[PDB]
């Protein structure tokens with residue numbers, strides 16, 4: 417289960433001591449958003465570096481189903497990963513969840529906003545309604561585990577910008593915005 | 608957990624029913640040869656479509672280390688290339704192969720190990736002497752995993768191998784197709 421992931425994190429996400437695994441965390445989440453974009457439902461993905469050691473990835477696709485919820489299953493249980501050109505394989509978002517000190521899932525779907533929080537891949541409470549909306553999509557925001565990641569524990573604009581540009585080229589037509597609230601930088605990638 | 612790979616191959620290798628996964632199996636092995644080229648040791652890679660439902664990939668790099676189980680066995684059995692299949696290793700190919708053969712030329716000896724469904728048939732063994740170095744992986748896809756397209760197709764391999772050679776400039780890749788009597792050579796600098 418996720419216990420195995422927490423025990424041997426580098427095996428599942430990449431080197432935890434040089435920033436490689438840390439940035440893979442973001443790219444794995446981005447891969448899920450691109451997948452939803454390529455399915456024709458998402459027209460815009462937004463990746464944001466926040467000033468609190470989190471990154472969020474937001475799409476305006478269908479929203480993960482919420483009726484535990486299918487969403488919780490997706491987040492917690494350790495599927496074609498080849499729809500996304502340049503996508504990571506052999507990892508799902510549950511690995512990112514396991515290796516996050518906190519992860520926040522916000523889903524806009526069927527008129528409601530739903531939210532669930534996890535810590536180290538363990539939910540705090542059942543998915544709950546937190547608003548109403550006519551919009552749709554999925555937002556994952558996570559704070560990396562500081563037990564897991566060392567030396568490079570903060571997300572770096574240049575690493576994210578370089579890879580997101582590459583992913584936008586490899587998956588032509590997908591629009592990715594990178595917003596960096598910590599550093600006051602922004603980019604739009606779209607080919 | 609190779610059983611996990613067999614049970615749910617989609618995350619690891621892709622679609623198993625339309626030939627895309629099947630060909631990813633070849634590209635994963637080729638990625639390992641390209642890695643050895645990027646490391647500055649392999650100059651030439653030979654990809655061969657055999658007439659027995661197998662593909663071999665041979666390089667002329669250092670050869671996977673064989674000391675002790677051997678380091679080679681761990682790579683095959685335990686779960687930087689541009690266009691590489693990121694996050695998967697050759698143990699995934701092994702898991703989803705009916706048979707896989709590893710032949711290593713290293714330190715003056717030829718070493719061989721065979722696997723069935725990712726489980727070794729015997730301990731790595733010496734099978735010859737050589738002045739050459741390199742790694743050869745030859746595999747036969749599992750028909751319990753792959754359906755509909757279960758044979759390797761020249762055009763799919765030719766297209767992607769040309770791309771991989773361009774994306775990883777310097778390495779020479781030969782595609783030999785003994786089943787169909789076709790050959791090509793890809794090399795960019």
Ligand SMILES: CNc1cc(F)cc2c1[nH]c1nc(Oc3cnc(C)nc3)nc(N3C[C@H]4CCN[C@H]4C3)c12
Pocket residue numbers: 445446448449451452473474475477478479480481490495509554555556
């Ligand atoms: C930051 N965004 C983000 C982040 C994220 F971690 C996951 C999703 C995610 N956006 C998503 N959108 C959908 O949309 C779907 C809705 N309904 C179905 C049947 N499939 C997909 N599904 C999602 N799922 C369900 C699985 C299908 C393929 N990938 C898995 C994750 C996501």
Ligand SMILES: CNc1cc(F)cc2c1[nH]c1nc(Oc3cnc(C)nc3)nc(N3C[C@H]4CCN[C@H]4C3)c12
Pocket residue numbers: 636637639640642643664665666668669670671672682697742743744
């Ligand atoms: C068809 N070819 C092929 C196929 C294949 F499946 C594996 C290799 C392979 N060729 C290889 N050559 C080396 O060479 C090395 C020797 N010594 C060291 C320290 N590193 C690499 N290592 C190999 N290894 C060891 C790991 C390093 C990165 N990739 C893993 C697989 C391969």
